[PDB]
UniProtKB/TrEMBL annotation, chain B:
Protein name in UniProt: Glucose-6-phosphate 1-dehydrogenase
Xref: NCBIfam families: zwf (TIGR00871)
Gene3D superfamilies to which the protein is assigned, alphabetical: Dihydrodipicolinate Reductase, domain 2, NAD(P)-binding Rossmann-like Domain
UniProt organism field: Leishmania donovani
Domain Glucose-6-phosphate dehydrogenase NAD-binding: 59-243
Listed Pfam families: G6PD_C (PF02781), G6PD_N (PF00479)
Coiled-coil ranges from the UniProt annotation: none
Gene: g6pdh
Family: Belongs to the glucose-6-phosphate dehydrogenase family.
EC number(s) reported in the record: 1.1.1.49
Catalytic activity: D-glucose 6-phosphate + NADP(+) = 6-phospho-D-glucono-1,5-lactone + NADPH + H(+)
Taxonomic lineage: Eukaryota, Discoba, Euglenozoa, Kinetoplastea, Metakinetoplastina
Amino acid sequence: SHADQDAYVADVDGILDVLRAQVLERIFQFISKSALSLQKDDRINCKVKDEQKSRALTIIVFGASGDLAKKKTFPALFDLYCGGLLPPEVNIIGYARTKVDDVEKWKHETLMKYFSNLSERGCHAEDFLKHISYFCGAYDSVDDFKRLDAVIREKENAFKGPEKGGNRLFYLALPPSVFASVCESIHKGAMPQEVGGWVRVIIEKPFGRDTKSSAELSQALEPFFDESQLYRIDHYLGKEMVQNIITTRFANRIFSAVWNASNIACVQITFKETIGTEGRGGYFDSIGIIRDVMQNHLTQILALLAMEKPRSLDAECIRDEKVSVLKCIEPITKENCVLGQYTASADGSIPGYLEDVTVPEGSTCPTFAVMRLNINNDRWAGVPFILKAGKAVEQKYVAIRIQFRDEVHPYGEATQRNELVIRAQPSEAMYVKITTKVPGGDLRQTHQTELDLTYLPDAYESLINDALLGNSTNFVRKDELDVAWRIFTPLLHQIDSGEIKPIPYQAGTRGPKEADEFIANNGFKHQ
Amino acid sequence: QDAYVADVDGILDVLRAQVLERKPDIFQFISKSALSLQKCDRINCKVKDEQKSRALTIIVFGASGDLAKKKTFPALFDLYCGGLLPPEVNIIGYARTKVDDVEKWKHETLMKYFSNLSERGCHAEDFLKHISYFCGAYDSVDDFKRLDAVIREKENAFKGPEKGGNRLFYLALPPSVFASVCESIHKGAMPQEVGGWVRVIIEKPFGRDTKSSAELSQALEPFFDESQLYRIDHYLGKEMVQNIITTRFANRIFSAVWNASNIACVQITFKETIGTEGRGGYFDSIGIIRDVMQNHLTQILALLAMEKPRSLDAECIRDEKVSVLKCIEPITKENCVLGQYTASADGSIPGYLEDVTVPEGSTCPTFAVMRLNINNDRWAGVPFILKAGKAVEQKYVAIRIQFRDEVHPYGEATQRNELVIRAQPSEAMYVKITTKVPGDLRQTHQTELDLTYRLPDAYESLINDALLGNSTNFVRKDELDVAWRIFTPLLHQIDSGEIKPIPYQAGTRGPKEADEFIANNGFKHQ
Amino acid sequence: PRSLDAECIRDEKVSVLKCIEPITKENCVLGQYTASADGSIPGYLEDVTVPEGSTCPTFAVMRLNINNDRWAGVPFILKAGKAVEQKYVAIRIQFRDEVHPYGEATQRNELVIRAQPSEAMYVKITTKVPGDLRQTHQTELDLTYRLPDAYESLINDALLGNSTNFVRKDELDVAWRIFTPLLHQIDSGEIKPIPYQAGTRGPKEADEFIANNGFKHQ
Amino acid sequence: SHADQDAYVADVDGILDVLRAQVLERIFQFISKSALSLQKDDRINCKVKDEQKSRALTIIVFGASGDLAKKKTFPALFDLYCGGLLPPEVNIIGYARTKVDDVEKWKHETLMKYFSNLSERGCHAEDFLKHISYFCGAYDSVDDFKRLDAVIREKENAFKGPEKGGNRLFYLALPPSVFASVCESIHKGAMPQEVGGWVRVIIEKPFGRDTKSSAELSQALEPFFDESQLYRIDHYLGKEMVQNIITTRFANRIFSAVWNASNIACVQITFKETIGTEGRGGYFDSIGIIRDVMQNHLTQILALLAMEKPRSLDAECIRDEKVSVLKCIEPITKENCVLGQYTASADGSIPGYLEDVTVPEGSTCPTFAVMRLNINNDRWAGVPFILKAGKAVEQKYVAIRIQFRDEVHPYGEATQRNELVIRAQPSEAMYVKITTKVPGGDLRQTHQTELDLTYLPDAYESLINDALLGNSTNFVRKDELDVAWRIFTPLLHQIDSGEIKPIPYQAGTRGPKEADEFIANNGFKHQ
């Protein structure tokens, strides 16, 4: 029955392929006619693409003096440069409100301080600054963007290459409250030239804090930029993990056939940090652990892991699949959620969550959450999916763990549950645990063995790269974002209404003992 | 063309997604989705010889109003493109505001709202040539005499055999000015004695209770009679009414089951996803019952429940509409559940009370389920349920007739048959029955039999009907009176606060209590 | 098996063999070796103790059909050859391809259990290469963690009284019923061995037979 | 990519060198430990060698009365003597079946007639004969070899030098049919004394006539003598050409870096003689031009020229390389071979091949062959290699010609293909053709110039010398010989089966016009 669902998809896809094979030799009405008839039977080595070095490119980092841009975005562009993935004629413009006199001292004192000191990159720092300009403006004056437009065209017409016009990535390293005006501004007069050039806009979290707030922003931006252009970025989702999820499964019959209710006992996605929040109640307390990394980061990982088979690796096909599976998820219930808030470490080195000037005294805000999701579809019905996130815990870990059902017969206690782990932190690792024979001679003399399925810019860097390459896969689409918010918002309301409460846990522990009881009571068996 | 490799792949991508959602048993589904994925011409004149034999003038009062410019004029345009207006048709937009440039007015106020369809848009300029603007009062006899002269002008120039002219007056106005417009027409701009009829379309609301409605009917009747008067309900399509009347009355099978001994319940449902959209203030005076239930749903009920007409002539159908309505008991508060929408989850629809033009403490229902009792031989003890809702989970209008179950012998291997007539979001009509599956008789399948074989839309259908003089789908004076007597006690109870609307979230089905009410009044889910 | 006891394993050996249809001549390609290029292996017919006109096969590929729920329509191919290109004994399970979505960026997974010329057991899968998902690599996962050799293992087994790897009487009977019609057809001359040169893989027709019965090379 | 292959070899060799540098200061397990840790980061002037004049040496020329021995081997030993490369105590024994009475008249009438008359050597003839003995025996009687053994020990114990025992070179100037018995005979009782002495055995062509025949001989000899002892000799491969091939390339970055597919357009190895076969159909007709010089002589030249880089100049390292590259050669096809047979010269002075009593009338035997080999490896894939051999042609020539790809841009017709020529006959010559500027002044005014890369016993003599010195480089090893035969045998079969036929050509012409068309159609452009 599980085999027939997959077979039905594979049949449909096979029928579409033979239509495709025909309708690529000389119209909708040829589909219907063929349907009836089928029935009857060191130096930066440039790695960039040709199209990439074929037209001009300007990256505009708006809010260029803000912490995010100088400490993260520009150092990330710097690494892409060093790794030979920026086009060689790349123009980069930091835009910001403060007027500046010595442009070169700004690049050095505001930007360079934060570049990578590593000796493999030290050499290139000054090289990369030749590509950077400064521009002083506001985020709402149509004037300033007409001025910017002229500056961009200056650099664009100066390009020494075949195609005219210029591609423009607008990076809004800004508070979301200004996204709408900046976007309207770019629409009114800083879009790429008519002759040629794509436009793309990277926007930064938070993408609202609930269904309502998030949809307001989407409605606000959608008059000016469509889903082929907008790129809602998640700093923590890396290429390497996404490929581990998609390829390992979908390229391989062995894994594909077991990726279902009939074979999987339980699935946990875990995001754990030893660091706390000290001195950042300024952002965190309003947000909480669920909105911070679970609604956005863990849920995209879930979507990629649980989705049905896309017909191809085209980005929007994958995104279609993320949306369909997210739509099968029941809104999380307060009955399926255990919350924590951290207090001071036993040793007394790390201070508790409430022990912070920037945190409302008596705050009830969760720094820890374990929850069970139910995915109601043919593939997943009944399978526990556990999401876990926690700050100030025992170790820094990010992994998927899939636990498969035991074969009780006939090995019994001489075997145990196979598992598959996809780890991204503290380092990349992907393995299956299986039971093998030992040499030298009874059949029940067995070992556990971990098979290593394993065969560079970091997560953030590779997202900027994908956006330059025009690949939307790992970016949350508008519809996708809405559904995710609908999965979490009702629980978030019950939390704000006090209906469930965080359990205290000392910084440096696993978290609340009740969380582990919860996990073990939701289908997981300790190895 | 590496963008031919692309677009067909997207086509396939859409087909794929269709089949994986619906999951057919696949070639034929792909076949019939390819054809649903497809689905400078001269206007061929489809008009009768009586219609081309005399001049026609259509006068839209309130022409610069939202109803007339967004709905009436685009409708007339569609009829023009469809060949359903005579070739020499004269249409006059009458309004109170002076206009420097009538040609600008035509482009900016009307053409803006014409269907931007390829096979329509290229007639727009030809259509505007049939349209004039006229500036006047709605109550001054001299203005209608000046209108009369503007019309006679066009009539007396008619390039055709009969003299005089037919005049359709469309009153796209508040009901408060109808009496004065009608009187003004009576005294000032009736058709020429030499020849032509006068017809007058008037828009809802037709009062807000028995008394006010009767007052309004008495205020109009000295000027126009029920052969002239056309109380339009925009939603009642020709296609759904043929479904209701022919399927039943032409067939022994459906005639024979259309009664108390075979029908468990009947539900007439009107659902929209839109809210009041800023215009809460206006709606707050009316409420959902007066808005669509006392008028639209009740006409549907009438047609569904009537005895057999002495003929298929319009007034015979109307007589039967009247007779069955006369058998309906006034709705009680106990047989009524009210709702009032709150904000949608994504906030695209603000709550009904969030609208600043809605007064604090409003108790106005945006949703209503109720039960009517038709006390006659055909219907005694059969629950008729009317349901109407704004800001619910989908856009949908349908009749669902559920027949009594056959307990023996199939037991749980069968369930209640249904006949469904849907008008929105598309036309369908079908029966759910149980059939065998291709050893045991107990192995059965619920199956749907499609009974249903650019036509004009429901509103356009009614305007065409009024041009041809077919009264069928218009509420007659006596019919209207009786309809108000069904609902007015309930409305009084509601206005005295005896029933309170239950809050529901916009985008949901409505209050859980409304579904329980349906399930408690003869409906089974299965 | 109902358990890992020897006779339970043997019961199951018997049951599955009982589901196999007798091999037909049409599902059999025969070979007979000729002299190696360097003459180190004289041709089969050059041996004086071989009678003139011998039609005896030194090589055989054939297909068996296991008619049960688990195996219906799965080709099982047995191949045995003398004087071919290498010394080798292995099981190769090839899994069905995932056409969508990787297309030509993937290929059929395999599980291989080799005993000769050394023990190996491994799965071929496709994995990602460390931007595009379409960039993939075929990789081999070793599943295998002076022990006695195969023959010594069996004698030890007989000393300990473990029957597992020995053909039981009923099992044997059933095995003969799989092959005997084919052997009769072969002894009546209805199939003729194709000459192949010693040191080569065997007749080209044997490889084509494999490729025509569900195996893809890639 | 071509640069990365060479770089990979040079890296590996560099890693092995640092292992070598460590593991020469105090075991396999030290390789693995150092591997992980490297990751984390007139009168004869005697020219002979000391070892040579340090132990006794007996050269036994078996079949000493045969034509080969008296006309070639003994005169060749005579020249080595004159050139001061035989040890001064050298014993030389001619062995043969005829019983002889006056040993001194045999040396004079059978041997001396054929020594070099040249006045620089005339003087030494009688000197060299003092070193020669005669021995009468058969090639299968264990008795005779025990008798020989005693005679050798006689001469060996009489040696007036430090080390005891005696080194023995057995030279089988014999028909190959007797190699096996003579070798068994020497094994049974004429090997060097236990105390000391190497044994070496020179055997003479033909080494079979195909894969099967050649491997029989190898199996026959290998019970008695291994590959450090057996010396399959090719009279025509000279030291001077071998060094030109190996040194010029492998000692020099300039040549090494261009010795590949990416730079070379085509390569021809040519062996041409004006002489015919008259009165030697007795050997030739059974053999043909392909087996005579192409399978054996041209192919060793090819191997040396095409081989990958050996880690050192140790002989067996070079031979390993000859084998690996030979293994990359596709068996020659009849589609890639043009054959000729010569008829009488136009002038009518040289008689045709069939015009000979010792030649089967109607013989189809090729006196001429041009063929294309494909070497399927990273270095050579797609590069035409043309072998050409012909008897009774226009000139006596033996040369390698390497034709490099044109640099079309930017000199155009003011430049042409560089070439490298290594000639051995009619005289030694090695040059590159390149394009230079002329003085007195446009950049496109250019000349062709041949650079001379040039800075003594003959070919045969220097092979006997290498064998005395124990150097196997220019001798075909057992595995090497097998692979070469596998490259040629299938074509030789198609030839014997008549599937391609020789074209007639008049003695004294280039050969068949079709051969030159063939060459020009296989990548070569005339200068």
